Amino acid sequence: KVLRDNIQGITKPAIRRLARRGGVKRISGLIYEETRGVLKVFLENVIRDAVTYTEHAKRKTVTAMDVVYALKRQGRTLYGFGG
Amino acid sequence: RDNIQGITKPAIRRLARRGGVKRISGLIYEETRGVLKVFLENVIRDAVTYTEHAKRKTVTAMDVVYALKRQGRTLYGFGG
Amino acid sequence: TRAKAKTRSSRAGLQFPVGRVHRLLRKGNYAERVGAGAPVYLAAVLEYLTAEILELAGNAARDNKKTRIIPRHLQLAVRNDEELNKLLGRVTIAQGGVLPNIQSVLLPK
Amino acid sequence: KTRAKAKTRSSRAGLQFPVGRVHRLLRKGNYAERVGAGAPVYLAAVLEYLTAEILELAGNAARDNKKTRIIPRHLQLAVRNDEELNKLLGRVTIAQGGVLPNIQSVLLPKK
Amino acid sequence: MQIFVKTLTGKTITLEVEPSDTIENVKAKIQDKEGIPPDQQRLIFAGKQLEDGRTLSDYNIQKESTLHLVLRLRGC
Amino acid sequence: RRKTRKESYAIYVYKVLKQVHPDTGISSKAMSIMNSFVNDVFERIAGEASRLAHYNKRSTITSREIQTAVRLLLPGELAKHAVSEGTKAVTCYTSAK
Amino acid sequence: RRKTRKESYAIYVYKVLKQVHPDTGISSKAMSIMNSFVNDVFERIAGEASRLAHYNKRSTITSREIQTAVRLLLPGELAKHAVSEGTKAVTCYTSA
Amino acid sequence: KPHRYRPGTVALREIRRYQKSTELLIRKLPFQRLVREIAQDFKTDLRFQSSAVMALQEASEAYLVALFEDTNLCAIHAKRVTIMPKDIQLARRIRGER
Amino acid sequence: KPHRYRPGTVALREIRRYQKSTELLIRKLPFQRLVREIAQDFKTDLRFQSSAVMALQEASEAYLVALFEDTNLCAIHAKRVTIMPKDIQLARRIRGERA
DNA sequence: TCGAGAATCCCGGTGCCGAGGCCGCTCAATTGGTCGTAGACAGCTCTAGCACCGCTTAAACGCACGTACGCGCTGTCCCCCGCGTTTTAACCGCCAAGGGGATTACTCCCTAGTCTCCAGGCACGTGTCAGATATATACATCCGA
DNA sequence: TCGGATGTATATATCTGACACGTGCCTGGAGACTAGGGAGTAATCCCCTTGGCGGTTAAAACGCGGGGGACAGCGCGTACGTGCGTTTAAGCGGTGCTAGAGCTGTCTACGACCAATTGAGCGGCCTCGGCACCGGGATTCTCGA
C-alpha cells in the first residue's frame, strides 16, 4: 500500500522537546519546517546506503547489521546493536 | 629562540586578504600564531614517529604526506 | 610421553585469550605472515583499556547508589574524561543521554 | 606446436589502461585470498572514465585562458566548479591551486 | 544555408541545413551522408563549441561559414 | 651505474589526453597530481570491495563487488556512467577471446 | 536442533570487572556496548599495523609494528601506560 | 488571581528534566511510517527488522540534539536568546555539509 | 593637494590581486627555522629534505586560508565588518577541533 | 551632475629550458596444461514479521491574554587605514666537506604446515533478589506584598 | 524587605523478571617435528645535506593625520510563553498465517601454479618551440567640485 503525508507525524511538541534537551530556551515559529527538511535529508542518505547493502546480499529483509554498516561508512559509528 | 616571531604581521594580513577579509582588528595575530603552532606540533610529531620507526635520521617528503593523510588532510602532487 | 597443557595467556599472566587473537590476526587478511609476539602485545593493550573504562564506570555507578552498570554510567564515565572523550569523539552510545550543562546567559537575573 | 602471436588483454576489451598491471596489484595488495577474472577489467574501465572526464574539463579551462598546456591551476579550476567532482574531492588539497574568485556582497562599496 | 566544415584529416565537406535546425538533426544528416555517428564528433564555430539542443539561428551561423570538426573517440 | 625502475600511469594518461583533446600538452606537476589521483581512487575502491566481500564470508573478489563498491562510493550521475562503461567493457572482453 | 556458536568477549570482560570492583554486576546492553568497543579498537590497531608494514616493503607484522601503531593512535598518557603494559607482558611471556 | 509563572521558568524546568533522563522523545509509529515511506522509493515490497528501526531512531535523535546545541551557540554569539533559521543554516554551512 | 583614496579601496584591490594569483605568502627562511625549532623537541640532530619543508608550508597555508574564510562568515553573521578573536574561537569550536 | 590623476591591460620583440620524441634492453605479462575445491543449485524446517480487532487514557490541538524582547534610530569616541621615510635581512650566486641513504652478498633461525589429543567455552535450564511502582510526607523555591 | 502555594526530594512496602550459576559436550587450541625462505649484518659507493661569504634591493618597521565603524542608550509594537477545555490516536493485549531466513548435500566450472619466451615500458640524449620578461601606449577606473 502506497503511503503519503507522513512527514507531518513529527509534531511540534516533539521538536520542542528535542530542543529542550539540547539546551534551548526560546524557539521562533519558523524552525519546525527547517528541522523537518534536515531530518528528511539525513534519513534519505542513510536509507539509501542500507538498501544498497541489503541488495548486494540477495536478501529481502533489512537487518540491523546493514544499518550499522551504513552508519559506520559515514563516520557516525553506533554502539550497542551488534558488530 | 623566539622564531615564532618570524611570522610577520604583513604576512598574516596577506593570508587574510586572500581569504576574503576587508577589515582586521588589532589582536588577530596572537591567535593566528597560536593556532599555527598547534597545527605544526601535531603534524611534525606524527612525521617524526614515522621516521623513527623507519630507522632513519632524515625525514622524507613521503612520511609528511602519510602523516597528513592520517588526519584526513590528503595532499596531492608530492609523490604520494 | 606428553606434558600437561598450559595456555599461552597463563604464561603471559593475562586475562584475555592470546590464541583467539592470534587466529583472528592470521585469518583477517592483514599480512602474509604473523610473528609470535604480536598477540601478547595486543591482548595486553586491550585488557588495559577495558580495565580503565570499567573502573571509571564502576565509580560512577557506585556514586548513584546502585549495584549494577547501565549504559548511562558508561556515557558519564567516557564523557567526563579528556583522553577517553578524545578517543571516542565520533561514537554515539545508545541509551546514553547528555551532560547537564546550561549556558550562563540564559539564567535568570 | 606453434604458439600464436601474443595479444594484450587490454586490447581485447578495447581499453587504454593496463589490465595486467591492475590484476597484479590486486593480487599482491592483500585484499582477498583469490581474485576473479572480471574485476581488473571493471576497475580499469572505471579509472579510465574518471581520468577522461577530469582531463576534458581541465583542457577546456586551459583553452579558455589562451594556453596550450595544463598547469595545476587549471586542474583546480576544473575541479572546484563542478558540484559532483567537488563533492568527490571534498577533503583534498591541490598544490599550487589557489582559490575561487569570490567576494561577499555586503563588503562591496555603497552607492 | 550552405556551410563548409573541415575535419582533423584536413578535408572540408559542404553541409546544407537551415538556421533553425538543431544540432541533432544536422548530426543525423551528416551521419546519413558520411556514416559518422552523431555522438562521436563535436564542432567549433568561432572558438565556441555547439550545443546539441541549440540551432544555428541563435548561434549566428550563416552561409559559407567555416566550422572546425574534432573527433570524440569513445565507447567500450 | 645502477638505477631502480619506478612505475607510473604517465603514458596512459597522456594517451587519454591525446584521445580527448588532440592538441594540448601537459606539464610535470599536473602529471604527478593525476598519478596521485589515480592511486587514491584505486585504493578507495579496492578497500571497499575487500570489506564488502569479507562481510558476506566469501573468499573471492568478483565484478559484483566492484560494481557495488562503485555504486556506494561515487555520487549519482558519475556512478551511473561508470557502471555503464564497466558493464560494456566486461561484455566486450568476454565476447572476444 | 541447537543453534550455531557465536563468539564474544563475555568471560574476559566479566573477569576484569570482578578484578577491579569485586562487588558490582553488569547488565546486558552495557555488555554489548563493551563488546563492540573492544572489536572496534582491535580493528583500528590491526589496520594501522598492516599499513605500516606495507609501507616499508616488509611481509610480516611483529611487536614493533603493534607498538608504533599504538603510539600513533592513542593520546599521550594512555599511550605511555599501554606501552609499559605491553612490553612488560611480552618480557614476562618470553622469560618462561 | 490564579498563580502564574513568569515567562521563562517552565523552560528551565523542562531543560533540567529532559537533560536528566534518557528515553526517546519521538513517538514510534509515526517514525516507522516515515521510514517505510522514505524507503519505498528505492525498492518496492521491502520488510524491516525492529532493531533496524530502533537503531535509525537513536541515530537520528542524537544527530538532531547535536545540531540544536550548535544552533544555540550560534544564536548566543549574536546577542540573542531566540534561535532562528539562519542559525541552523550557518551551523550546517560551517560544519561542512551541503 | 596629495591624492588619497578613501579607506577601503586598497583592501578590495588587494583582495582581487591576491586571490587572482597562486603563489606562497610567507617567507621561506623564517618558516624553515620555525619548523626546525618545533621539531628539535622530539628528537635531537634531525635532518630535513627540501620537499618536506615545501609540503609543510603548502599544507599550513591552505589550512590558514580556509580558517580565515570561516572566520569572515562568522563575523558577517553578527552585523559586523571587522573580524575579532571571538569569531575565530567560535569557528574552531563549531568545527570540532577545539575540545 | 562633470574632469584630473593612477592603476590596469593589450601589443610587440627577445631569449631560454623543459617537453616531446628516439634507441637499447631487460624483466614481466602471455600461452599452454593440470588439479583441487568454492560456490551454485535444489530441498527442507521453522521463526518472526505483517495484519486485524477492541479498549483506555494520555497526549496533541485550538484559543485567549499579557509582556518581555527584537529591531530601528541617534550620538560619540577611538582606532585602523593610507602614505611617506628609514633600516634590515632574504635571496641569489658560488665554493667545500662529508654523513648517511641505497645496494649486494652471505648465513642462521623463525614460522608455516601436519598429526594427535583433550579440556575450555558455549547452549540450555533454574532460582531469587535488585529494582521499578505506589503511597505518603517533609522540604526547597518562586512570585506578589 | 516577608509569606502562601507549588513542585521536588525522601522514606517504606512489595512483587516480578533478569542476572548469576551449574552441566555436557564437542570443536578449537596445544605439544612435537620438519623444511625453507625472509630478514639481520657487514662492506662499499656517492649523492645530497649542511656551512660560509659578499651584495643588492625589495620588504619590513615606525610615525602621523583623520574619517568611518563599534558600542551604549532609548522607544515601540508584535510574536511567543502559560494556562484551560476538547478531540484524537498511540499504546497494549491478544489471535492467525505464511513468506522467507537459515542449514545440508553434491557436483562441476573456475582460479592457483608451473615452464618457455618475447615485446611493452623504462632510463638516457637532444632539439627546438611555447612561455616568461621588458618597454610602450590605450584603456578604465576613483575622488573633488
Automatic annotation (TrEMBL), chain A:
**Molecular function GO labels:** DNA binding; protein heterodimerization activity; structural constituent of chromatin
Gene Ontology CC entries for this record: nucleosome; nucleus
Q: Where is the TATA box binding protein associated factor (TAF) histone-like fold domain?
A: 8-73
Q: Which keywords does UniProt give here?
A: Acetylation, Chromosome, Citrullination, DNA-binding, Hydroxylation, Isopeptide bond, Methylation, Nucleosome core, Nucleus, Phosphoprotein, Ubl conjugation
> Where mainly located?
nucleus
The keyword Chaperone is annotated on this UniProt entry = no
- Key word Hydrolase present: no
Which GO biological process categories is it annotated with?
A: nucleosome assembly
Q: Where in the cell is it found?
A: Chromosome; Nucleus
Q: Which family would the database say this protein is a member of?
A: Belongs to the histone H4 family.
How the protein assembles, per its UniProt entry? The nucleosome is a histone octamer containing two molecules each of H2A, H2B, H3 and H4 assembled in one H3-H4 heterotetramer and two H2A-H2B heterodimers. The octamer wraps approximately 147 bp of DNA.
According to its UniProt entry, the function of this protein is described as: Core component of nucleosome. Nucleosomes wrap and compact DNA into chromatin, limiting DNA accessibility to the cellular machineries which require DNA as a template. Histones thereby play a central role in transcription regulation, DNA repair, DNA replication and chromosomal stability. DNA accessibility is regulated via a complex set of post-translational modifications of histones, also called histone code, and nucleosome remodeling.
This protein is called Histone H4
Which organism is this protein's natural source?
Xenopus laevis
| Name of the gene | LOC121398084
State which stretch of the full-length protein is shown: 34 to 116 of 116
TrEMBL record, chain C:
From which residue to which does the signal peptide run? none
Cite the GO molecular-function annotations of the record.
Answer: DNA binding; protein heterodimerization activity; structural constituent of chromatin
Looking at the record, the residues that make up the Core Histone H2A/H2B/H3 domain are: 1-79
Q: Which UniProt keywords apply?
A: Acetylation, Chromosome, DNA-binding, Isopeptide bond, Nucleosome core, Nucleus, Phosphoprotein, Ubl conjugation
User: Could you tell me where this protein is found in the cell?
Assistant: Chromosome; Nucleus
GO annotation, biological process: heterochromatin formation
- Basic residues: bias regions: 1-9
Q: What is its main location?
A: nucleus
One GO cellular component, as annotated: nucleus
Name all Histone H2A C-terminal domain ranges: 82-109
**Quaternary assembly:** The nucleosome is a histone octamer containing two molecules each of H2A, H2B, H3 and H4 assembled in one H3-H4 heterotetramer and two H2A-H2B heterodimers. The octamer wraps approximately 147 bp of DNA.
Q: What does this protein do?
A: Core component of nucleosome. Nucleosomes wrap and compact DNA into chromatin, limiting DNA accessibility to the cellular machineries which require DNA as a template. Histones thereby play a central role in transcription regulation, DNA repair, DNA replication and chromosomal stability. DNA accessibility is regulated via a complex set of post-translational modifications of histones, also called histone code, and nucleosome remodeling.
What family is this protein classified in? Belongs to the histone H2A family.
This protein is called: Histone H2A
